[PDB]
Design an enzyme around this catalytic site. Structure first.
Site, mmCIF file in Angstrom:
data_model
loop_
_atom_site.group_PDB
_atom_site.id
_atom_site.type_symbol
_atom_site.label_atom_id
_atom_site.label_comp_id
_atom_site.label_asym_id
_atom_site.label_seq_id
_atom_site.Cartn_x
_atom_site.Cartn_y
_atom_site.Cartn_z
ATOM 1 N N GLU A 1 -2.400 -6.806 -9.716
ATOM 2 C CA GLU A 1 -0.865 -6.388 -9.257
ATOM 3 C C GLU A 1 0.170 -7.225 -9.610
ATOM 4 O O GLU A 1 -0.141 -8.301 -9.509
ATOM 5 C CB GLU A 1 -0.895 -6.397 -7.671
ATOM 6 C CG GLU A 1 -2.011 -5.658 -6.983
ATOM 7 C CD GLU A 1 -2.273 -5.767 -5.359
ATOM 8 O OE1 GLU A 1 -1.279 -6.447 -4.918
ATOM 9 O OE2 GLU A 1 -3.200 -5.325 -4.809
ATOM 10 N N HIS B 1 0.759 -1.094 0.017
ATOM 11 C CA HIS B 1 -0.019 -0.253 0.201
ATOM 12 C C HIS B 1 0.856 1.317 -0.004
ATOM 13 O O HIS B 1 0.269 2.283 0.213
ATOM 14 C CB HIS B 1 -1.136 0.118 1.220
ATOM 15 C CG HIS B 1 -1.891 -1.071 1.266
ATOM 16 N ND1 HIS B 1 -2.342 -1.894 0.351
ATOM 17 C CD2 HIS B 1 -2.394 -1.656 2.138
ATOM 18 C CE1 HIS B 1 -3.189 -2.854 0.650
ATOM 19 N NE2 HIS B 1 -3.260 -2.712 1.755
ATOM 20 N N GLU C 1 -2.683 -13.691 -3.736
ATOM 21 C CA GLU C 1 -1.544 -12.504 -4.013
ATOM 22 C C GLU C 1 -0.404 -12.877 -3.049
ATOM 23 O O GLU C 1 -0.353 -12.140 -1.846
ATOM 24 C CB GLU C 1 -2.146 -11.133 -3.810
ATOM 25 C CG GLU C 1 -3.184 -11.168 -2.438
ATOM 26 C CD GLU C 1 -4.034 -9.741 -2.350
ATOM 27 O OE1 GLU C 1 -5.091 -9.878 -2.155
ATOM 28 O OE2 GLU C 1 -3.190 -8.821 -2.436
#
Lengths: 401, 401
Positions: free
Chosen positions: A260, A230, A356
Site C-alpha cells: 500500500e 478498504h 502501516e
C-alpha cells in the site's frame, strides 16, 4: 434412497507449495495441544483454520464446511457441489455431504467423531444456531475452544510459510509497477484497478505449476475515496492534483500479502506534502520499532507521540499493523498480534507483521485525503527483515505520465 | 485525548439504485417486527443484513461491524479505517468507533441502545465469543433472534430490487459474450476469466453514475475443474474437446446475479453430448416448474424422477436452485428458499429463484465432467419470468474460435 454422506475423490492430489512435513507439523501441533487438554477431536469450521491445517480454501455459498482432526486422522468435510476439488486440495482424507437432508453435515461430523467426549471447536467462528445444532447432533459431548490456541500457533510462521509470503510480496511489487504505469490524469479508478489485478493474476499463474487464481484484488482510490483503507474501487475520474492510494493484494493458496502506497497525480502541492512527509517519517520510525520482544502497545504509544509533535494524532484511522499468514478481506487475522494501545502481546521471531501508519484529513481542510504507507516485516532473532521493495516516499511516488 | 466513538460524516451521500421509499420500507419492516415481539432495538452484524437495510456493504478485516435501529432511528457502526465511506453509502445515520480500545465497538452499540431491555441480534452470524462480549457490555438485556424473520422478509423482492436484478442479468450476458469470445484451444483458464471479469466491470461502471466495482468474479473451468460449481480458476490449458463451464457473477451494490453454461471447446463427443442433452432436458422442465403455488421439495422430487430414468440421479451435485437478493460467495443466501428434497416452504410471487440442475461424472468415465445450466426466474402471479438471455444447450454453446 439418496446419498447422505459419500466419498467423491475425483482426480489426484493437487500441487501444494508446502511439503508433507509442513502440513504434518501443523496437524501435529493440534494433536499435541489436544492431548495436553484431554481433547479427543478437533472440529474446524472457518475459512482460515481449514486452509491452515488442510491447505484447502473452501467457498461458502451458505453451506457448512468442516475438518476433523483426531489423534490419528485428518479429514475435511465438503459438499456435493464441490465434487473432488476439496480432496485434491486437502492434505489428508475428505468426505462429502449432500443437500438432500438438512443434517447431512452433522451426519458427516458424527462419522468422524464417534466415541469422542471433548470436541474442540472455534468459538471465534461457530455462531449461536451452529453451537446448538452441534450440541443436539452430538449429545454428551463437552465443547472446548481451539480458536485461541490455534490463533497463537499460527502467529509463528515456518520457513516454508515465509518463503510463500516473500513470493506474495514479490507479486505485490509487480502489481504496484502495473498500477503506477496505468495512472494518468483522466483515467478512471477501475481501469487502473483492472490493469493492476490482471498483472498480479498473470504473475501468480506463471510462478507456480498449479495454482488457484482467486480473491486477488486491488484498491485504487483517488480524492475522497482515499479516506478509507478498504474503500472499494469506483468509476471516479482521476484529476491532476488528486491524492491517490495504491493497494495491491495478491492471494496465493489462501495466504495474504499487501503493498500500500500513497501517491499523487502528476504533481503534489506543499500542504499535502507536509502531511505526506510526516506520515513517511512515522512509517520509517515504525519499521525501527518492530523488534523481537517489544510489546504491541509500546510501538503504538511511541508512534502516537510522534503524531503529537505535529498535531496529527487527532486524524488517526486505525492500528499501526497486524499479523499475517492465512487471512483475507473475508477471513483470518490473528487478533493476538495487533499494534493497538491495549495489546500487551510481545513480538517473537517468526511473526510476520505490518507497519502501516494512516492519517486521514477530512474534506474542507488543506491536504484533504488519506495518507498511508504499508510494509511487511519478518521478525527475526535480532530485528526484522523488510520484504516490501517498492519505493516509499516522494523520491519516486510522483507519477508524471 | 484519543476518541472512542467519533462521528465522521466526511463527504456527501452517494447514489443508490433504490429510492428513499424502498429503503424506508425495509427499515419499517424491522420496526413492525420489533413492535409485535416487544423488541426495543435491532442490532445487525452481518454483510447481508447491513447491506439490505442500509445499502452499505462493509469490509471485514477482523473488525466488528454493526447497525442499530431504534423505533425512530437507524444507524450504522463502522471503524476508523473506513472514514466517511460508510456514512456516504448508508441510508440513515452513522457513527464511527476506533481501534484504540477493545470495547470501543461496544461503546457505540451502547450509545444507540440506551434504555433497551430486549435487543434483536442475528443468531446466524454472532459467534460465541461475540455473544459473550455483548452481554458483558449490555448487562441486563435479553437477546432474541432476528436473523430468521429478516431472512423471511428478504425472500420477497420489490420492483426496485427486480429492476436491479434484471440489470445484473444483463451484465451476465455481457460477460458471457466476452467469455465465449476468449475461448480457444490453448488459452489458459485465467486469461478467459480475466477477459470475462474485465468486461463486466467496465459494463457496470458505465451503467451507473456512481457504482462500487468490487467482488465481481468469473469461474471458468475446463476438464476436471468442471466437477465443482465453485472450483476456482486455475492455470490449466484448455484443450480440444474439453468440457467447459462458463460462470459470470456481477456484484452490483451487494446484489448477486449469475449466468452459468456448459460449453465445449472445439467439439463434443457422443458420450458427453448425451449427458449434455439430458441435463438440458432437465433444465427445460425445471424452468416450467417455477410456479407460485409449487413448493421447493415438490420441484426437487419431480426433477429427480427425470434423472432416475437415465440412471443419472446418483451423479447429482447439489440442489436445483436458491434465493437471490443480497448474497455472495461470502455472505447471504436465504436458507428458507432452497430447491431441496426436505424444504416444505412454498414459493410466493416476488421471489427470485434459479434453476441450475448439475450432474457430475467422475474422471475415467465416458462423458466425464460437470454439466450445469443456470437461469434466474422472477416469480409472478401466474408463473415466472426468465431473465437469462444467453443460449442454453449444444445448439450454440460449441465454441469454434
Amino acid at each position: 434412497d439418496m446419498l447422505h454422506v459419500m466419498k467423491w475423490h475425483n482426480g489426484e492430489k493437487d500441487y501444494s507449495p508446502f511439503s508433507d512435513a509442513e502440513m504434518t507439523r501443523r496437524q501435529n501441533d493440534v494433536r499435541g495441544w489436544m492431548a495436553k487438554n484431554n481433547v479427543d477431536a478437533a472440529l474446524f469450521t472457518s475459512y482460515h483454520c481449514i486452509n491452515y491445517y488442510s491447505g484447502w480454501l473452501y467457498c461458502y455459498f451458505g453451506r457448512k464446511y468442516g475438518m476433523v482432526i483426531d489423534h490419528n486422522n485428518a479429514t475435511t468435510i465438503s459438499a456435493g457441489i464441490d465434487g473432488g476439488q476439496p480432496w485434491r486440495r486437502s492434505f489428508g482424507d475428505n468426505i462429502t455431504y449432500t443437500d438432500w437432508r438438512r443434517d447431512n453435515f452433522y451426519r458427516a461430523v458424527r462419522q468422524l467423531t464417534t466415541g469422542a467426549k471433548r470436541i474442540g471447536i472455534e468459538f471465534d467462528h461457530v455462531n449461536l444456531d451452529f453451537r446448538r445444532q452441534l450440541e443436539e447432533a452430538l449429545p454428551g459431548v463437552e465443547f472446548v475452544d481451539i480458536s485461541q490456541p490455534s490463533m497463537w500457533m499460527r502467529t509463528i510462521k515456518s520457513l516454508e510459510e515465509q518463503k510463500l509470503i516473500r513470493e506474495g510480496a514479490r507479486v505485490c511489487d509487480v502489481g504496484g509497477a502495473a498500477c503506477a504505469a496505468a495512472i494518468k490524469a483522466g483515467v478512471p479508478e477501475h481501469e487502473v484497478a483492472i490493469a493492476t489485478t490482471n498483472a498480479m493474476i498473470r504473475e501468480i499463474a506463471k510462478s507456480f505449476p498449479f495454482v488457484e487464481l482467486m480473491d486477488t484484488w486491488t484498491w485504487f482510490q483517488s480524492g475522497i475515496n482515499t479516506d478509507g483503507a478498504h474503500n472499494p474501487v469506483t468509476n471516479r475520474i482521476v484529476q491532476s492534483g488528486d491524492i491517490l492510494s495504491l493497494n495491491t493484494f495478491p492471494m496465493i493458496f489462501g495466504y495474504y500479502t499487501a503493498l500500500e502506497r500513497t501517491l499523487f497525480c502528476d504533481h503534489v502541492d506543499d500542504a499535502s506534502l507536509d502531511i505526506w512527509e510526516k506520515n513517511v517519517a512515522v512509517h520509517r520510525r515504525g519499521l525501527e520499532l518492530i523488534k523481537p520482544g517489544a510489546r504491541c502497545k509500546d510501538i503504538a504509544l511511541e508512534l502516537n507521540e510522534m503524531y503529537r509533535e505535529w498535531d496529527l494524532l487527532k486524524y488517526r484511522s486505525f492500528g499501526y499493523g497486524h499479523s499475517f499468514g492465512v487471512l483475507c478481506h473475508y477471513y483470518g487475522r490473528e487478533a493476538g498480534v495487533e499494534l493497538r494501545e491495549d495489546i500487551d502481546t510481545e513480538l517473537k521471531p517468526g511473526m510476520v507483521v505490518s507497519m502501516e501508519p494512516m492519517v486521514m484529513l477530512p474534506e474542507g481542510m488543506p491536504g484533504a485525503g488519506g495518507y498511508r504507507e504499508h510494509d511487511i516485516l519478518i521478525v527475526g532473532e535480532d530485528g526484522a527483515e523488510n520484504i516490501t521493495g517498492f519505493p516509499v516516499g516522494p523520491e519516486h511516488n510522483i507519477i508524471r505520465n
